């Protein structure tokens, strides 16, 4: 599992693997770990699969019911605060996940949430087992003055650099770009694998 969130000027780029394993054994070469929980808000799950999917269904329900009752989308800090209260009211029968919540309310935000409900905002975050390789790329190549094109190419370089030194990460890569103008746009398969083929990488 390898999950990345990048905060640019007016965009959030969130990208993920697609591999589900069982301790050496690639059970599913094609998973789904990048979800759209609201119009301008995306969640990226990591950790245990079964708890993470149930958290996705709860957060889609609570965010949509919030949007109907109040006619405005939930602010991202309230999404991460809500999810921190949900994860922390249990804490001793816990959900074995770690989560990224990224979105746009007035400025772009990326919140990283652990299994006991500690939400911390940061300009870039990464969860999963191949997170330190992503942190290795993003320490030396991330600049907050990039465009969205260099952002997407950066996250493809980071996840493709974590696919080769982590055995629990692999498969096709899911990139989703969140702007105010179009919102949550998940990039198509052929565009991403054209970027992988164009940067000189292995899919």
């Amino acid at each position: 599992t390898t999950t990345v969130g990048i905060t640019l000027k007016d965009a959030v780029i969130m990208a993920t693997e697609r591999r589900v394993t069982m301790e050496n054994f690639i059970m599913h070469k094609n998973g789904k770990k990048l979800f759209q929980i609201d119009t301008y808000t995306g969640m990226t799950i990591a950790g245990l699969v079964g708890d993470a999917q149930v958290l996705v269904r709860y957060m889609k329900a609570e965010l949509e019911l919030y949007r109907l009752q109040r006619r405005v989308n939930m602010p991202i800090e309230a999404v991460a605060t809500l999810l921190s209260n949900m994860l922390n009211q249990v804490k001793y029968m816990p959900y074995m996940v770690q989560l990224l919540v990224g979105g746009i309310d007035t400025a772009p935000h990326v919140f990283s949430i652990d299994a006991a409900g500690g939400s911390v905002e940061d300009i870039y975050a990464s969860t999963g087992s191949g997170s330190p390789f992503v942190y290795g790329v993003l320490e030396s190549q991330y600049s907050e003055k990039m465009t969205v094109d260099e952002g997407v190419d950066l996250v493809i370089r980071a996840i493709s650099a974590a696919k080769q030194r982590d055995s629990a990460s692999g498969g096709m890569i899911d990139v989703a770009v969140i702007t105010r103008k179009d919102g949550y746009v998940q990039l198509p398969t052929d565009q991403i694998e054209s970027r992988i083929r164009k940067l000189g990488l292995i899919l």
Binding site: A61, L65, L68
Partner: protein, 221 residues
Amino acid sequence: TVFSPDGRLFQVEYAREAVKKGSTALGMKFANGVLLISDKKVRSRLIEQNSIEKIQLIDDYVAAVTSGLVADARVLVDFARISAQQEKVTYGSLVNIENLVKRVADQMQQYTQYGGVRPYGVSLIFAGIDQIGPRLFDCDPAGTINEYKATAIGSGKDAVVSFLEREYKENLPEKEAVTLGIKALKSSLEEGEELKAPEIASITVGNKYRIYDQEEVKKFL
């Protein structure tokens, strides 16, 4: 709530008398869609007309209008929203609207069974598209559900059910059937009143709701 000697529930018909004081509202099926119209009677300059809500969404694919006591209406709209989200959490998608209407009307029935509670004085219309298609429902304070093609609730119910009984060709396009419905809502009134801008919402299979702004409403008026 007990039985009358001729087999009637008096609190339920008194609840229907509380329904007959509400606002007139229409529901109508399009060729490939459905439609909700509500009579927005503006009463003063001092009320925010931009924030009063007659058609209020249960879901992006399910809306509902109400008539009767507005507090009980708000309670049952909140219950319909929570029940819709429970069906989305449990199953994954809202496949059938009829079972949302049955989960509302089982509670509305439940308060006409037990002593210590009074019935809801509201009648609702549930419209929207699902896996079967564009669907329209009506719910009565005894918890009585009927699936219609065009119905009305409120004070001016019988004028609109009479007008749509004469009118309403079945597979109409959007704009022509909105014109038909607003002619029904004109037919319910008197000549001492005129329609101030109604509230209109529509849905077509594949899309979400499009609540009309006042340009299209005054333009259709």
